[PDB]
C-alpha cells in the first residue's frame, strides 16, 4: 500500500497488470477480529408436537440387500431383451463460457 507512485508505475509496467487493485497483502478490507455474538437457528426436528422419532428414523429404514439370484435358495429361473446397467451417458456439451483456451 505504501509504495510511491513511481514504484507503482514501475511494478505495474513490469508485471503487465494493475497490481494496486488486487494486492496480495491484507489491510482494512478484512473482518474485525472481534464480532458480535451469533444466534444460530435450530433444525427441523425442534418441534413440540407431531415429531415422533419413529417417523424420522433413517437408520431403522435400512434393510438387507434384495436377493436377485441365489444358487442356494432363490432360482433366477418372446425373446427377453438385453439390458445395460444404466442408460448410456449423454455427451457433454462444449462450454459456452469459454470453449477454448
Amino acid at each position: 500500500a505504501s509504495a510511491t507512485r513511481v514504484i507503482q508505475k514501475l511494478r505495474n509496467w513490469a508485471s503487465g497488470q494493475d497490481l494496486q487493485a488486487k494486492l496480495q497483502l491484507r489491510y482494512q478490507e478484512i473482518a474485525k477480529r472481534t464480532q458480535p455474538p451469533p444466534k444460530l437457528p435450530v433444525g427441523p426436528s425442534h418441534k413440540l408436537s407431531n415429531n415422533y422419532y419413529c417417523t424420522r428414523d433413517g437408520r431403522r429404514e435400512v434393510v438387507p440387500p434384495s436377493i436377485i439370484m441365489s444358487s442356494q435358495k432363490a432360482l433366477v429361473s418372446t425373446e427377453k431383451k438385453a439390458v445395460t446397467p444404466a442408460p448410456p451417458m449423454k455427451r457433454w456439451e462444449l462450454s459456452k463460457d469459454q470453449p477454448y483456451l
Binding site: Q72, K80, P88, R91
Partner: protein, 114 residues
C-alpha cells in the same frame, strides 16, 4: 461430411472408412456367434446387440448422425468396442460360461453379518 481431424482421445486414430469397418466387425461377430449353442444367453443377447448396431450402420450414411444413434462416443470408440466384443466372443466359446454352476459355496459363505 468432412473427415474428422482428431478423435479427441490420445492414442485413438481417425478411421477413414468407419461404415465399412463396423460392417466387417459386426458381421464377423455374428459369424462366431453361430458357433455357440442356441440356448446360451451370451449368444442370444450379443446377437440382439450386434444386429441392432449393424442396422444403424446400414441406415445412417452420415458419420455424425451415426454417432448420435450408436451412443458409444466417437465412431472410432465404437469400432474399438466392436473389436473388443469379437475378442470376447472367441474367449466365451472356450470358457463355456453357459454351463451349470461349477460348485456351490459353503452355506454361510455370503451371509453378512456373521
Amino acid at each position: 461430411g468432412l473427415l474428422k481431424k482428431t478423435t479427441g482421445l490420445v492414442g485413438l486414430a481417425v478411421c477413414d472408412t468407419p461404415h465399412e469397418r463396423l460392417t466387417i466387425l459386426y458381421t464377423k461377430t455374428l459369424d462366431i456367434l453361430k458357433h455357440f449353442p442356441k440356448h446360451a444367453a451370451y449368444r442370444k443377447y450379443t446377437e440382439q446387440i450386434t444386429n441392432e448396431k449393424l442396422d444403424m450402420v446400414k441406415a445412417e450414411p452420415d458419420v455424425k448422425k451415426l454417432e448420435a444413434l450408436l451412443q458409444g462416443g466417437e465412431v472410432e470408440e465404437v469400432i474399438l468396442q466392436a473389436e473388443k466384443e469379437l475378442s470376447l466372443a472367441r474367449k466365451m466359446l472356450k470358457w463355456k460360461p453357459w454351463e451349470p454352476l461349477v460348485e456351490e459355496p459353503p452355506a454361510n459363505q455370503w451371509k453378512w453379518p456373521i
